[PDB]
Write a protein that binds this ligand. Structure first.
Ligand SMILES: NC(=O)c1ccc[n+]([C@@H]2O[C@H](COP(=O)([O-])OP(=O)(O)OC[C@H]3O[C@@H](n4cnc5c(N)ncnc54)[C@H](OP(=O)(O)O)[C@@H]3O)[C@@H](O)[C@H]2O)c1
Ligand code: SF4
Lengths: 96, 88, 263, 147, 95, 59, 64, 171, 80, 296
């Protein structure tokens, strides 16, 4: 049972990049978790959600590095997400 | 040395106080009875201190009669305390 | 928040004068220049917690002036949301009471449940808390089709959630040492003071309002009113927990009885 | 120089990491303030703690209505606060009086007593919008303390 | 001889400190603690140097009776602050 | 419809008295209080990371 | 989950683990046998006194 | 450097200088921390670890702690600065000149005194003991005993019964 | 029973920690006198020599021999 | 002598990293999450609190009574660090002639830290509130002295090194079964917030959190140990760190779960409930080495 949970963590690190991929997600975002990606957004925002995970699981709306000219890499807030928040992030079901 | 162990702790404690101050730039007589009971019990504990220290060599028939006797009067003092102690 | 000027003779309080009214927002004079529909969201902002227990008292008072009985469905929304406020009010009545004492856990245990409770308010009305929903014309907007399944799903999970408090706070030696025997008031003087809420109801006097005077479709819904023995804080606490347990029964009977029609 | 400029970033980061608030109740807002503690919208995920500590605290969050009776009460607290201090006006009452703006007893929105740095607009300030009382404050800390 | 020239001197200094006053009655009881402390050290040196072994229990008993006076006399000081406002030597009634 | 709060002394003799006396000599209810908090630790925290996850809303 | 809590214990499994190791590993440098003797009672002190008298004049702990 | 007991004995008297002087009961209270804690070291140097730590447990762990209460009960809030106080500084300056002037005469070993006893060297004869014992020795290895002194246990118990009863009758 | 059965179950109901204060402290006094096991503890306590042994000059004496293993003197062998 | 410096700086780090564990364990006890925005798992916050509180945060003086307010942190931080010296971590730093006597005395001398801070403020409401907090610390040191004197009476002298040898196969939890419950409550004495709560604010509780670890290790010697093994000091230290931290979680457990006792009823816990129980056990622990032979 403990070996299966450890294998799931190792596969999660292998999914999102690797040694440089998971470390970039751990420093920028609060927690790193793998899931299905929506992709399509103005100014390259990831928005990889769709996973069952837990309560209110429209997870991981990763902010784009420099959206207009702010260089949001170390510091980023909820200033991003262009007209897609009502569906992919909050209320509706279908992807925008 | 014991003095080498003590002074190093105190000097670094005062050093943190130097960082704390120099570096920044911009009634009720009832509680007295508690202290009375504490100090009077300390001395009974002080008399009961050599218990795991004197029992190694001395006679047990003479000690046991006296060792319990100190704890008895330590409880007899509390038996007098029970009859009207206080609201606190 | 509160002034509370204390006169301590030694250790015990002899003269406790609560110099209150430090939040006199002036609702009295300000409503006089507003119409009945305009003055509605003021009474939401009367109390911190009650939203459908508040405005309920105002809308029925306007209904008594206009001589208008609200539609059958709207009255069943008024009980379903009236009891979900009765659930919400007794959360804060326990948790902030525990927070003022020094209990750390039971505050957070109910606040995750409480944040799930406001999801019902959000989906039914635009605001998080203060919802201009119970109006002089009964109920403003209908329940969405998604909510009625989620109300039952929440009440199914609430059963163990309310059992968490009785397995934590009631059986404690600390609480039965603390809250027991503070201001034991069961006397007929309490009638003269006229608390009516949990003081009279939770000690001695059998009288309440829900059973004696029906407001919106009562007697049809089954009730169990908790009445204590002594006027202490602990009997006033336990009756509130028993009120919390005897409120899901009202919610479940509201789920069973929903006549389809006008709002 | 470059060494001094990077050192000033570390001093700013010390406040950007952790902010310990003295949250004023006296409002319907105070419940939404307590929803920060609620696990769904976690705030202890940041360097923010609900220990309060009135004398020690940095960022006093003025929640809701300020009456004329509480007007000298909040001012004397603000004077006792340490020098790196910020004021968050939480709710429409704390901004400019949402309701009770034309009432006799209510001060017209905090600024007349105590200077406000970050305004939180919403009556019931949703725990979504209230996380702009922390993250936007943390974003606003640039200061540019040169000399 | 060597050490006894200081601890006896500390006793005589405290002997002056008791009988000299600047209106504070708390300081006299504080000096009574020092008097017993100076008697504790002077007794300790006499017993520890000349290996008595039996007499080592005696300053421990002396320590008990040091605190017997410096509490029951201290309780009477509180009774002065109950009848009068603040404890002062000047504040008296007896003739 | 009239519920009651007080049990009016459940202890009578021997078996019903000593177990009620047990939770005062030793603790047990402290261990029972520990038990509910223990199960609460092991279940997953329901937390939303604000700049990446968002709270549920209405249409 | 416990990928967050246990690193808070693992960091304590270093810093609180230091005083136990630092006091033990220091006897390698102070002594050629990894041991320091405590007197407690005057008999064991006299044994240490004659150990300094035999062979090694300056060193306290020495073989033969 | 060479002396152990004699240097600490000067600091011991230095604490008592603040008792002959009256610098308010708060600053005089600090004297029992300084002179008391150093007073342990004077006992500890000749041997007997138990008897040296008795001051730590009772005088520094009870006596002055209870004396800390009564300073708050009567004559409280603020202690007046001893530099501003008249004759208090005068008693302090005359108190130190009875000790510091004497130390200069203690230099070159022997010194004249009011008593017949002289100062001496106090370095070789500072310990005054050779080997004496071995196991459970040093005079205070078996310091306190309930055996032999059975009478002294009873009378100490009597006075400690009196203390609890009497103070209750006073207050 | 007038107070044996009456004033015991009341003590269990009203402050049962006071039962422990008299019973455990009571067993601390009575049991040391009753048990035939206290005699063994006194034997080894006197047998343990903290001080150095002293030799006596013998002139027609019994129950004394050389330092080597021989049937002489006390030498307690209570349970090995 | 580098060992003293190896028992101050990594010790202060353990106090610094305590604030995370106090926020994370209590966090998971409350269904919220610990610090995460700061570092990888919030591990960079103890240093972040150190830069915040010390450097830019100033002190507005209430009165500043010359000698005091600056003297009280010396009695706080200094006396808390001296307690680490005689601790029997494989081979202790200058092993005392009597171990626990130095342990009980410096803890009873730590009462002054909250006393002098009460004198530091001119306001009467501060000192009356301070003396109430002294009253809690002063009372539970009587029980702290009694339980210690009954545990040692079973086996060992005052030396802390002999307390390891007695626990060769059996822990002292089982023979001192009511005392194991009793000592755990009495350790909550130095303003532990779990029973009752009252220079700069920062360094003042840095001594108070240090005393919590101090009592956690003191429980892990008096009641725990398992073995010693002189051949490998590593096997003891790894095993000790698990035993000590499991008791550290339990102090974060009582604080999380249980409310304040009411100050008066906390004083009713002592004298009326605790002291009749401990003295009866003290009477019982006198008779035990006499009833059956066992006086080491
Ligand atoms: N009572 C008296 O002391 C007295 C007596 C006679 C006349 N006066 C006159 O009345 C005036 C009173 O002012 P004060 O002395 O009270 O001022 P002050 O306290 O010295 O403060 C001066 C402020 O102005 C800014 N400042 C000054 N010179 C500047 C420059 N060259 N470039 C950019 N910023 C500058 C500084 O900001 P930065 O730190 O950001 O640069 C500083 O915060 C004086 O100008 C003086 O001539 C005063
Ligand atoms: S802004 Fe709204 S919720 Fe906040 S205090 Fe004012 S009325 Fe109440």
């Amino acid at each position: 049972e403990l070996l299966q949970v450890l294998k799931r963590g190792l596969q999660q690190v292998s999914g999102h990049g690797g040694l440089r991929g998971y470390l970039r997600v751990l420093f920028r975002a609060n927690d790193v978790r793998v899931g299905t990606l929506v992709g399509e957004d103005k100014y390259g925002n990831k928005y990889y959600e769709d996973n069952k995970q837990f309560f209110g699981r429209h997870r991981w709306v990763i902010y784009t590095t420099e959206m207009n000219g702010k260089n949001t890499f170390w510091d980023v807030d909820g200033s991003m997400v262009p007209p897609e928040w009502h569906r992919w992030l909050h209320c509706m079901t279908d992807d925008p | 040395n014991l003095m080498l162990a003590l002074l190093t702790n105190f000097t670094l404690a005062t050093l943190l106080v130097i960082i704390a101050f120099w570096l920044p730039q911009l009634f009720s007589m009832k509680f007295f009875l508690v202290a009375i009971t504490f100090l009077l019990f300390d001395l009974e504990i002080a008399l009961l201190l050599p218990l795991p220290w004197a029992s190694q060599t001395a006679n047990l028939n003479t000690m046991l009669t006296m060792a319990l006797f100190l704890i008895i009067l330590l409880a007899v003092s509390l038996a007098y305390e029970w009859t009207q102690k206080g609201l606190e | 928040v509160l002034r509370l000027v204390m006169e301590l003779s030694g250790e015990m309080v002899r003269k406790c004068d609560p110099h209150i009214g430090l939040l006199h927002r002036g609702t009295e004079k300000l409503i006089e220049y507003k119409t009945y529909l305009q003055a509605l969201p003021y009474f939401d902002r009367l109390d911190y917690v009650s939203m459908m227990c508040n405005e309920q008292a105002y809308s029925l008072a306007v209904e008594k002036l206009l001589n208008i009985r609200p539609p059958p469905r709207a009255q069943w929304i008024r009980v379903l949301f009236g009891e979900i406020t009765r659930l919400l009010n007794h959360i804060m009545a326990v948790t902030t009471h525990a927070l003022d004492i020094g209990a750390m856990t039971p505050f957070f245990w109910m606040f995750e449940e409480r944040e799930k409770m406001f999801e019902f308010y959000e989906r039914v009305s635009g605001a998080r808390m203060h919802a201009a929903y119970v109006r002089p014309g009964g109920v403003h907007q209908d329940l969405p089709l998604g909510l009625m399944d989620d109300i039952y799903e929440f009440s199914k999970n609430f059963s163990l959630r309310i059992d968490e408090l009785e397995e934590m706070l009631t059986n404690n030696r600390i609480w039965r040492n603390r809250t027991v025997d503070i201001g034991i008031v069961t006397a007929e003087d309490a009638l003269n003071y006229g608390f009516s809420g949990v003081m009279l109801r939770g000690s001695g006097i059998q009288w309440d309002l829900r059973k004696t005077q029906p407001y919106d479709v009562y007697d049809q819904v089954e009730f169990d009113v908790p009445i204590g023995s002594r006027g202490d804080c602990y009997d006033r606490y336990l009756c509130r927990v028993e009120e919390m347990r005897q409120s899901i029964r009202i919610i479940s009977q509201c789920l069973n009885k929903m006549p389809p029609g006008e709002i | 120089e470059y060494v001094v400029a990077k050192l000033d970033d570390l001093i700013n980061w010390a406040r950007r990491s952790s902010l310990w608030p003295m949250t004023f109740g006296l409002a319907c807002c105070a419940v939404e303030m307590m929803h920060m503690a609620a696990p769904r919208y976690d705030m202890d995920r940041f360097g923010v703690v609900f220990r309060a500590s009135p004398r020690q605290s940095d960022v006093m969050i003025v929640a809701g209505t300020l009456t004329n009776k509480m007007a000298p009460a909040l001012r004397k607290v603000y004077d006792q606060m340490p020098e790196p201090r910020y004021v968050v006006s939480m709710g429409s009452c704390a901004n400019g009086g949402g309701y009770y703006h034309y009432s006799y007893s209510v001060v017209r929105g905090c600024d007349r007593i105590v200077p406000v740095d970050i305004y939180v607009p919403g009556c019931p300030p949703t725990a979504e919008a209230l996380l702009y009382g922390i993250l936007q404050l943390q974003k606003k800390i640039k200061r540019e303390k040169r000399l | 001889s060597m050490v006894y020239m200081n601890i006896m001197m500390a006793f005589t200094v405290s002997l002056v400190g008791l009988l000299m006053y600047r209106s504070h009655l708390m300081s006299s009881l504080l000096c009574l603690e020092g008097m017993m402390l100076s008697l504790f050290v002077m007794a300790a040196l006499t017993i520890l140097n000349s290996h008595f072994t039996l007499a080592s229990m005696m300053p421990i008993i002396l320590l008990v009776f040091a605190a017997c006076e410096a509490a029951l006399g201290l309780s009477l000081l509180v009774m002065v602050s109950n009848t009068y406002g603040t404890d002062y030597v000047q504040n008296l009634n007896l003739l | 419809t009239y519920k009651y709060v007080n049990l009016r002394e459940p202890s009578m003799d021997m078996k019903s008295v000593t177990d009620r006396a047990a939770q005062t000599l030793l603790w047990t209810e402290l261990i029972r209080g520990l038990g509910m908090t223990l199960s609460y630790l092991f279940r997953e925290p329901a937390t939303i990371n604000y700049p990446f996850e968002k709270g549920p809303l209405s249409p | 989950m416990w990928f967050e809590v246990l690193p808070g214990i693992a960091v304590m499994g270093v810093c609180l683990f230091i005083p136990g190791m630092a006091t033990a590993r220091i006897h390698r440098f102070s002594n050629g046998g990894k041991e320091k003797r405590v007197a407690h009672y005057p008999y064991q002190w006299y044994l240490m006194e004659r150990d300094r008298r035999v062979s090694g004049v300056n060193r306290s702990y020495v073989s033969k | 450097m060479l002396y152990i007991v004699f240097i600490l004995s000067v600091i011991f008297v230095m604490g008592f200088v603040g008792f002959s002087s009256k610098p308010s009961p708060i600053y005089g209270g600090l004297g029992l921390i300084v002179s008391g804690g150093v007073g342990c070291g004077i006992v500890l140097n000749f041997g007997g670890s138990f008897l040296g730590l008795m001051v730590f447990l009772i005088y520094l762990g009870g006596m002055m702690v209870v004396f800390g209460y009564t300073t708050a009960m009567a004559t409280e809030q603020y202690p007046e600065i001893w530099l501003s106080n008249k004759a208090v500084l005068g008693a302090f300056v005359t108190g130190l000149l009875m000790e510091f002037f004497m130390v200069y005469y203690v230099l070159k070993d022997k010194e004249v005194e009011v008593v017949f006893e002289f100062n001496g060297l106090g370095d070789w004869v500072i310990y005054d003991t050779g080997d004496s014992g071995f196991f459970s020795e040093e005079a205070m290895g078996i310091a306190a005993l309930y055996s032999y002194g059975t009478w002294l246990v009873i009378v100490t118990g009597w006075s400690l019964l009196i203390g609890v009863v009497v103070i209750m009758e006073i207050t | 029973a007038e107070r044996v059965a009456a004033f015991l179950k009341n003590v269990w109901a009203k402050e049962p920690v006071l039962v422990a204060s008299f019973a455990i402290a009571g067993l601390a006094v009575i049991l040391p006198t009753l048990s035939p096991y206290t005699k063994y503890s006194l034997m080894i306590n006197x047998x343990x020599x903290x001080x150095x042994x002293x030799x006596x000059x013998x002139x027609x004496x019994x129950x004394x021999x050389x330092x080597x293993x021989x049937x002489x003197x006390x030498x307690x062998x209570x349970x090995x | 002598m580098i060992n003293i410096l190896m028992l101050i700086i990594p010790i202060l780090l353990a106090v610094a990293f305590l604030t995370l564990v106090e926020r994370k364990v209590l966090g998971y006890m409350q269904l919220r999450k610990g610090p995460n925005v700061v570092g990888p798992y919030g591990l960079l916050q103890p240093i972040a609190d150190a830069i915040k509180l010390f450097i830019k945060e100033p002190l507005r003086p209430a009165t500043s009574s010359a000698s005091m307010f600056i003297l009280a942190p010396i009695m706080a931080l200094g006396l808390a660090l001296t307690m680490w010296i005689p601790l029997p971590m494989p081979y202790p730093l200058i092993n005392m002639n009597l171990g626990v006597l130095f342990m009980l005395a410096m803890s009873s001398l730590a009462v002054y830290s909250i006393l002098w801070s009460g004198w530091a403020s001119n306001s009467k409401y501060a000192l009356i509130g301070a003396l109430r907090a002294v009253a809690q610390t002063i009372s539970y040191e009587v029980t702290l002295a009694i339980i210690l004197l009954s545990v040692l009476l079973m086996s060992g002298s005052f030396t802390l090194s002999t307390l390891i040898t007695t626990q060769e196969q059996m822990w002292l939890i089982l023979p001192a079964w009511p005392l194991a419950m009793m000592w755990f409550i009495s350790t909550l004495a130095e303003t532990n917030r779990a029973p009752f709560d009252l220079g700069p604010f920062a360094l003042f509780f840095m001594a108070e959190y240090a005393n919590i670890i101090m009592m956690n290790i003191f429980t892990a010697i008096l009641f725990l140990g398992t073995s010693h093994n002189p051949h490998m000091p590593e096997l003891y230290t790894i095993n000790f760190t698990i035993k000590s931290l499991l008791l550290t979680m339990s102090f974060l457990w009582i604080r999380a779960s249980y409310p304040r006792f009411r100050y008066d009823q906390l004083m009713h816990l002592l004298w009326k409930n605790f002291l009749p129980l401990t003295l009866a056990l003290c009477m019982w622990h006198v008779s035990l080495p006499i009833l059956t032979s066992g006086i080491p």
